[PDB]
From a paper:
Nsp10 belongs to the superfamily 1B (SF1B) Upf1-like family of helicases, which could unwind both DNA and RNA duplexes. In addition, this family of helicases contains an N-terminal predicted zinc-binding domain (ZBD) which is conserved in all nidovirus helicases, including 12 or 13 conserved Cys and His residues. In this paper, we present the structure of HP-PRRSV nsp10 in full length and truncation, which has a different domain arrangement compared with other helicases. The N-terminal ZBD has 13 conserved Cys/His residues, twelve of which participate in the coordination of three zinc ions.
The diffraction of the crystals of full-length HP-PRRSV nsp10 was poor after extensive optimization. However, after conducting the lysine methylation protocol, the resolution was greatly improved from 10 to 2.5 Å. Basic Local Alignment Search Tool (BLAST) searches of the PRRSV nsp10 sequence among the solved structures in the PDB database revealed that the sequence identities with known structures were low, with the highest value being only 30%. Moreover, the structure could not be solved using the closest homologs as search models after extensive trials by molecular replacement. We determined the structure by single-wavelength anomalous dispersion (SAD) phasing using the signals from the Zn atoms. Comparison of these three structures showed that all the overall domain arrangement was similar, except that the truncated form lacked the C-terminal 168 residues due to the degradation during the period of crystallization.
Numbering used by the authors: 4 to 433
The structure:
Amino acid sequence: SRMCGYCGAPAPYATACGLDVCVYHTHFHQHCPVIIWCGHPAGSGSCSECEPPLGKGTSPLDEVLEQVPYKPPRTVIMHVEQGLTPLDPGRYQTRRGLVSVRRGIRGNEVDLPDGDYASTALLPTCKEINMVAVASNVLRSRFIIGPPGAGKTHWLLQQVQDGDVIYTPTHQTMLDMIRALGTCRFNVPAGTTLQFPAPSRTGPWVRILAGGWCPGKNSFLDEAAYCNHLDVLRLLSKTTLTCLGDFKQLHPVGFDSHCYVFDIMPQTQLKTIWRFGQNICDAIQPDYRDKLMSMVNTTRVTYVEKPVRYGQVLTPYHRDREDSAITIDSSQGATFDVVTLHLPTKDSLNRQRALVAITRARHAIFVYDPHRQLQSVFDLPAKGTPVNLAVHRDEQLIVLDRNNREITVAQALGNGDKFRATDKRVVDSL
Ligand SMILES: [Zn+2]
Ligand SMILES: [Zn+2]
Ligand SMILES: [Zn+2]
Ligand SMILES: [Zn+2]
Ligand SMILES: [Zn+2]
């Protein structure tokens, strides 16, 4: 009992290209013949039963199939003896209608009486297509649109895991992906004119798109805008996809072809951040539609048990300002290397203020939060960095190492010195 590839209804018939169809859809598949009850193709007018004409496609599948040539296969004899035949297992049209050659321990089983039958095999073209699954899986998929510049390649590397599968359209894109991953599984395709490395034993699979679905945990689609539309539908019939694409420019002058599914897929626009690290981007994400990707290093986050004066000090209320400290409201549109979020007063912090305070610093932020009130507004875990930090403190240069100790030496630890301020740079040398 087979179901229709279009609508999922019971399917007694099939297209020559391997699509199971219900009675209704026997007459809306212009791609190739559909042998119906009278033994002729629907709409052929070979007899009076097949005179009603074919209708226009009811599915995007039909539009996709306009670029997929039907090549009629050879008419081959199927020899039958006690329900056994030499022909390969599959599905065939015969004078007794559509029949299946099943694999078995005794042999290739076929439910037909002894004889010889002229047989045309169904092509594999739409053997794995299921448009009700495509619809469902499209909803549970995502299309990651990249930014104008770079970074889209590095998003994938942070997301990919050893159990995952990455589908890619060409030999070259497959090679590009394999080089970017470093360690991955694959089978070098026959006939290729590229120099493929050796495949690893572990890592994500890199599969050529034309090869079709193979099982995995998460499935990705590389170069989505370049991919074969029918192959994409084959995948979406079996799994959901994370589909990677580039920034949509205004080029359409017949210059844009991509699978229709991407225009109805849930979309995620990537945005490059140059001001602070990824850990900050993650904490602030709830306030933004775009997925924020840091194109710079991790911003340090340290939870001090006692007050401190590193970099610019920030605090909600004027009452708690000391020395050259400012309010969080006064810090809007200002940028620093180091910042100290000073929160002595209970219930003094909301989302808006906290968002401003967290997004001022470039390299480090120290948070004095004795009331533990930042937790109730933000998820911001403590993050260290193996770096030698440096900043002024009331007309006096000072430096702190990776373990947040006030060391005053000349490059003793042997770590990097991160700083972007005008005064900190020039004073650093001399
Ligand atoms: Zn149907
Ligand atoms: Zn067809
Ligand atoms: Zn007919
Ligand atoms: Zn790529
Ligand atoms: Zn394209």
